[PDB]
Amino acid sequence: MSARVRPFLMFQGVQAEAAMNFYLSLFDDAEILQIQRYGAEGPGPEGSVLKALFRLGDQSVHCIDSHVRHAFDFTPAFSFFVDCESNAQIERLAEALSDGGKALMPLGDYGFSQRFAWLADRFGVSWQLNLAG
Amino acid sequence: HMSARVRPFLMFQGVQAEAAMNFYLSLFDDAEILQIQRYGAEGPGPEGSVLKALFRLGDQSVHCIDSHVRHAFDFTPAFSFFVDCESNAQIERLAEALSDGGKALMPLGDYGFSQRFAWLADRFGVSWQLNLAG
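ok -> structure tokens follow
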């Protein structure tokens, strides 16, 4: 079959399962497609994510836990962009995503759509939420 | 918790998005620009830069823009593309192309978890992981 390109999130420390469970709690049509955990032999902590794949709707996403830390983190340069279906949905998502995170652009009307927000979530990942007219 | 379309999004600083799309499209056969809107003379970005675009690499669509607003941050390895490569021929070609004017953070090799793997930062700074299973 043909080469596949997908986004990939590298969490530092032990966060990937928490993040997947959090993202699954935001979108009902979502699930974990693949999960492999470290055992007792390391190098990551036992039970942490060696490699996983989850989907949010029709979008699959890879992730890992990395026991190796680096100076960099997630930044707004590479983000998820969500085409929201309703005002209630964008309000719920903006509130959930900014909880323990940061509202880089707080929810409001920035002139190019009905509503938009730019959040960095509690794991540091950037989420753009857009509600089109 | 309703349906919503979730897609990756690349924010280039300055004027790079169309060059980046054209570059990525040259790497994959099943790839096209789906939507592109360039600034006219109205601003706020420079005329001819990308206001909004959507491209796809295989079955994966990706948003991008040119941002006339500059920031201190850049792309980092925390959020990357991961490519399940088909063959040795393909991974070698892609590694060469992506590392040209870029950085081989993990040069192409057998790192023990698959046949071949590389981690490149391309000439735009974007991280690409290339894997040839197993």
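The first helix of chain A runs from residue 16 to 26.
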